[PDB]
Design goal:
This is E3 ubiquitin-protein ligase UBR4. This protein has helices at about 1-10, 55-65, 70, 95-105, 140-145, 150-155, 155-165, 170-185, 190-195, 205-220, 225-245, 250-260, 260-265, 270-280, 285-290, 295-300, 305-320, 325-335, 340-350, 360-365, 370-385, 385-395, 400-405, 415-425, and strands at about 20-25, 45, 80, 85, 110-115, 125-130. The chain is mostly helical and about 425 residues long. Strands 2-1-5-3-4-6 form a 6-stranded mixed β-sheet. Helix 10 (about 205-220) packs antiparallel against helix 11, helix 11 runs parallel beside helix 14 and helix 12 (about 250-260) packs antiparallel against helix 14. The protein starts with a helix and ends with a helix.
């Protein structure tokens, strides 16, 4: 653990948190007669209750200790000044100390002058709203994390993967697992490390999926085990590695079991991360049959459970994420053979209005059907780069889709129909 912590601190030196500093809380000398009370505890330690984490907490402490109750609920009524600059109450006291005070008065207690706003006229002092540079310049990770590039050359990534694969007990391994994943999050910032991790010889995907499964099982057995945070980190690292790689079916089924898992459902972040990696990984027959009941559109319009909706949205996202390769084609062929595409076309043919006036109430009522957005998204996802699906939709549905693409609705049905027609133009 200590070796990997030391490697993290070499790659990305966390700025030394200012462990303890002192502050003095003084009245504006020009408001001495207007402000009741005085702060008696000068200098105050940064570790003292009410001295942070925000400048607002100091303002609230001054209002409380000086009995200025009317200013306690009003964040606009009191100003805090450091080095004759007005400091935003949203800023961290430790950052104000480091970035504003220590620039001129390093090692002295930070003098905070407090005053009532507008009592002597308009403030003429500079207002510091953000301690961070106003410039939105983005730090170059390839330069910021440049030292992580050594891990590709020294066999460091291979050592880290072997260490990750060696962790069989989540409870004992948690601390090592957290440090290794922190180090991986720095390593994936650098292109040389991403390209090394993409090599099949590294077995990166299987090790990461093993670590994900270990974290998911640990959180299912014991709530708040920390498996959730580990699973989220693994899913984020996997997304980056799988994206670089693109720039088995049993594992896909294990991932869908997680969509069913209440833990993953209750954890939107883990579910989101999981739903982002599922496309890249694309048994299959069983899961396609499992998504077939989720295609009760008429029933969906009548009534559907939050899960039915979530599952129908997830199936639309899966269908859109199926890549153009032999296995992706076989999965789309299986979905076509299971009749899911035909059932979506039969629903549209049954419910589409014959009225020529698109503003008619019958059209509004058709466009507001709950299943219709999901049908158009699903059909698009299945049609992209899949001639069998394109031909089936292109047989009889073009005149109806071409009516739909012309409609504006609050559900965006016209735009969804146009996007489906654009996917069908591949054929």
């Amino acid at each position: 653990v200590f070796i990997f912590e030391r490697l993290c601190s070499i790659i990305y030196p966390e700025e030394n948190e200012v462990t303890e500093f002192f502050v003095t809380l003084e009245k504006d000398p020009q408001q001495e007669d207007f402000l009741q009370g005085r702060m008696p505890g000068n200098p105050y330690s940064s570790n003292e209750p009410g001295i942070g984490p925000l400048m607002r907490d100091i303002k609230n402490k001054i209002c409380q200790d000086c009995d200025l109750v009317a200013l306690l609920e009003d964040d606009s009524g009191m100003e805090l000044l450091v080095n004759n600059k007005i400091i935003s109450l949203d800023l961290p006291v430790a950052e104000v100390y480091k970035k504003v005070w220590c620039t001129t008065n390093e090692g002295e207690p930070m003098r905070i002058v407090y005053r009532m706003r507008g009592l002597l006229g308009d403030a003429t002092e500079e207002f510091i709203e953000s301690l961070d540079s106003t410039t939105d310049e983005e730090e170059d990770e390839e330069e910021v994390y440049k030292m992580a590039g050594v891990m590709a050359q020294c066999g460091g990534l291979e050592c880290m993967l072997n260490r990750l694969a060696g962790i069989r007990d989540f409870k004992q391994g948690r601390h090592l697992l957290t440090v290794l994943l922190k180090l991986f999050s720095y390593c994936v910032k650098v292109k040389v490390n991403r390209q090394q991790l993409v090599k099949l010889e590294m077995n990166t995907l299987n090790v990461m999926l093993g670590t994900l499964n270990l974290a998911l099982v640990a959180e299912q057995e014991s709530k708040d085990s920390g498996g959730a945070a580990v699973a989220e980190q693994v899913l984020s690292i996997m997304e980056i590695i799988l994206d670089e790689s693109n720039a088995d079916k049993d594992q896909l089924v294990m991932l869908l079991d997680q969509i069913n898992s209440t833990f993953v459902r209750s954890n939107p972040s883990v579910l989101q991360g999981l739903l982002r990696i599922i496309p890249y990984l694309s048994k299959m027959q069983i899961l396609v049959e499992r998504f077939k009941p989720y295609c009760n559109f008429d029933k969906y319009d009548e009534d559907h459970s939050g899960d039915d909706k979530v599952f129908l949205d997830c199936f639309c996202k899966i269908a859109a994420g199926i890549k153009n390769n032999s296995n992706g084609h076989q999965l789309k062929d299986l979905i076509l053979q299971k009749g899911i595409t035909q059932n979506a076309l039969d629903y549209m043919k049954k419910h589409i209005p014959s009225a020529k006036n698109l503003d008619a109430d019958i059209w509004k009522k058709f466009l507001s059907r709950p299943a219709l957005p999901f049908i158009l998204r699903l059909l698009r996802g299945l049609a992209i780069q899949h001639p069998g699906t394109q031909v089936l939709i292109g047989t009889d549905s073009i005149p109806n889709l071409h009516k739909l693409e012309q409609v504006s609705s609050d559900e965006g049905i016209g735009t969804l129909a146009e996007n489906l027609l654009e996917a069908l133009r591949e054929h």
